[PDB]
Design a protein around this ligand. Structure first.
Ligand SMILES: OC[C@H]1O[C@@H](S[C@H]2[C@H](O)[C@@H](O)[C@H](O)O[C@@H]2CO)[C@H](O)[C@@H](O)[C@@H]1O
Ligand code: NAG
Ligand code: NAG
Ligand code: NAG
Length: 602
């Protein structure tokens, strides 16, 4: 009664081949199918031999669910998968892209653009490590990260998900990979997948390739660039990812010179698989195959053909699984897609699952639940937040006393602005909901809360969200901290051609700073029109989207640590200059890439 694929002491490739040779076509196509938890049930999983589940943004068992609730849900689905004839465990994926960010009480780290500002790849490794633990806390084994897009135009709604417009910084930050997955062995062959075991997660280098190079930063659009520029800007960090054993790669919705990435055999099979020697699995984006056609979904039969022939291995359906499986079965049955292509896809998927230990530990560890939101991880997020901050101005004239660092002891201070006491705004997109949200959406510390935690007990702190000029002038304030910026956004909703922050933002800054010396904290996912904010402000800090730990902001305001962040993108003078990147011929920045003022700790 011995079955070699079930023997944990056997080599991964032997186990993969042993299982593959036993599988029916239905079982094989099943492995290639990923479905939303929203459409999953025990019978669906079992009857269609489903390979994977995901949560999209905001796809949660309920609002406020505990780590245990998540474990029980994942285990519930796994039990059904394990009960099939062959007992192949599913892999469960989620967007844990700045912590385990769909989950209430999870540590929320700074978004990627802020992390680029740190120039600290080891910090990003440690964030990978902590994120893996908080993902495993919820029973999930797979994170759709890192986004290694090189955003070349801040008008893109996902520019905050890119570490930098400079591929060299993005390359350096692929250290997230061995954080999430564990360090690869001494001997390791570049392109093989790796996950250390049950305390780590499979990672996903996304979105292949040129997602950050689209025309006018239009999300999912066309990236017009010759092969030399594709390979010089958008590709390099994928080779770093191969070298670190990234387990999966997700394909972009975007096109390269008119060709849909989800139909690009030359790049997916010819380049990623056959040239970079990637041996993990390739996954679609969410209805990415549907969007090959215009309109999307208008020829699903072609979507399946073109994508699977291009070399994709697993399809993030995520809803219409019966139609996907029916169509792909018909294609194989009619010889339109050869069995060799199906077998390659399934070999890859199994290779990842076996390598990562999923056949040995298919179920959640309840002892891991307490990892969620752990104070050690929050302390790391607080460090990352502080290191991400870029000091742009610290005095209106070169002769003024520097405003920062501010004194913790003062009779009375003002904290103001739409973003001073709003946890959701300081986290941005991909936090609790897909688009992010407003207000107190999870566990954390706002800027107001952090100021109150920081200051001397004799310092009276007044909050006013949008005070008028008289209020400020009459208040007897020593100084003000005023926080304003962008609202949360994700993907296409963030595409923005004007890059001006919503009012009241500027008007509040002008009222506050007109009455008392002020430090302006600008929360944004990218550079935004800033000359008016600068003109009003004594000091101005680009804080990006710093996450749940607002104390990282006050650690630098009040001088516990000096400012060290440096712009990881160009700051433009006007959006009519765009695209404008470091190294261009017409480079006329307000602040060049690398710019950042410093302070010393007090
Ligand atoms: O979340 C999986 C995958 O999503 C796409 S965008 C995705 C949202 O989570 C989904 O819930 C919503 O209804 O559709 C959108 C796309 O329209 C994303 O590109 C990728 O990074 C992410 O891993
Ligand atoms: C309080 C303060 O600004 N200190 C200094 C600055 O004047 C100097 O350029 C540098 C030298 O170490 O360190 C910082
Ligand atoms: C780019 O966006 C335009 C709308 O501006 C749309 O008509 C076109 O289909 C898009 N192109 C691609 C390749 O996605
Ligand atoms: C700028 O564009 C955004 C997002 O596309 C829009 O919501 C906002 O109203 C615009 N701002 C201005 C000044 O037109």
């Amino acid at each position: 009664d011995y079955v070699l694929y079930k023997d944990a002491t056997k080599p991964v490739e032997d186990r993969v081949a042993d299982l593959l040779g036993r599988m029916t076509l239905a079982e094989k196509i099943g492995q290639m199918t990923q479905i939303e938890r929203l459409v999953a049930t025990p019978d669906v999983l079992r009857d269609n031999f489903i390979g994977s589940l995901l949560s999209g943004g905001g796809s949660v068992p309920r609002k406020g669910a505990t780590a245990k609730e998540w474990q029980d849900m994942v285990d519930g689905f796994q039990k059904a998968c394990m009960s099939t004839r062959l007992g192949i465990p599913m892999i469960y994926g989620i967007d844990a892209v700045h912590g385990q960010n769909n989950v209430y009480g999870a540590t929320i780290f700074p978004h990627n653009v802020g992390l680029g500002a740190t120039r600290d790849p080891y910090l990003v490794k440690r964030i990978g490590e902590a994120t893996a633990l908080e993902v495993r806390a919820t029973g999930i084994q797979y994170a759709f990260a890192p986004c290694i897009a090189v955003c070349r135009d801040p008008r893109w709604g996902r520019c905050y998900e890119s570490y930098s417009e400079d591929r060299r910084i993005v390359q350096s930050m692929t250290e997230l990979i061995p954080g999430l997955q564990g360090d690869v062995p001494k001997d390791f062959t570049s392109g093989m997948p790796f996950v250390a075991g049950k305390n780590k997660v499979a990672a996903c280098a996304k979105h292949f390739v040129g997602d950050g190079g689209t025309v006018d930063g239009i999300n999912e659009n066309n990236t017009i660039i010759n092969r030399e520029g594709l390979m010089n800007i958008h590709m390099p960090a994928y080779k770093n990812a191969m070298d670190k054993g990234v387990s999966t790669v997700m394909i972009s919705y975007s096109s390269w010179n008119g060709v849909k990435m989800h139909a690009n055999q030359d790049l997916v099979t010819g380049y990623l698989k056959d040239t970079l020697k990637f041996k993990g699995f390739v996954i679609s984006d969410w209805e990415g195959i549907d969007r090959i056609t215009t309109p999307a979904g208008s020829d699903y039969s072609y979507s399946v053909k073109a994508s699977i022939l291009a070399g994709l291995d697993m399809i993030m359906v995520p809803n219409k699984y019966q139609q996907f499986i029916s169509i792909l079965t018909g294609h194989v049955n009619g010889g339109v897609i050869p069995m060799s292509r199906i077998d390659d896809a399934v070999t890859r998927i199994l290779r990842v699952k076996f390598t990562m230990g999923l056949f040995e530990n298919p179920y959640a560890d309840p002892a891991m639940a307490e990892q969620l939101g752990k104070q050690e991880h929050r302390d790391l997020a607080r460090e990352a937040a502080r290191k991400s901050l870029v000091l742009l101005k610290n005095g209106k004239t070169s002769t003024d006393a520097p405003l920062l660092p501010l004194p913790k002891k003062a009779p009375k201070i003002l904290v103001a602005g739409s973003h001073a006491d709003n946890l959701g705004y300081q986290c941005g997109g991909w936090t609790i909901e897909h688009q992010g949200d407003t207000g107190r959406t999870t566990v954390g510390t706002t800027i107001l809360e952090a100021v109150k935690a920081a200051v001397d007990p004799s310092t009276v702190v007044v909050f006013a969200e949008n005070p008028d000029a008289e209020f400020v002038k009459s208040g007897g304030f020593s100084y003000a901290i005023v926080a304003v910026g962008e609202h949360p956004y994700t993907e296409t909703k963030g595409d923005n051609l004007n890059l001006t922050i919503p009012e009241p933002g500027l008007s509040t800054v002008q009222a506050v700073c007109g009455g008392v010396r002020c430090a302006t904290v600008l929360i944004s996912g990218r550079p935004v029109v800033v000359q008016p904010l600068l003109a009003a402000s004594d000091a101005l800090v680009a804080a990006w989207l710093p996450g749940s730990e607002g104390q990282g902001v006050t650690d630098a305001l009040f001088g516990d640590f000096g400012f060290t962040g440096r712009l990881p993108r160009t700051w433009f003078k006007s959006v009519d200059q765009l695209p404008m990147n470091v190294g261009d011929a017409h480079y006329d920045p307000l602040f060049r890439l690398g710019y950042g003022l410093t302070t010393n700790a007090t």
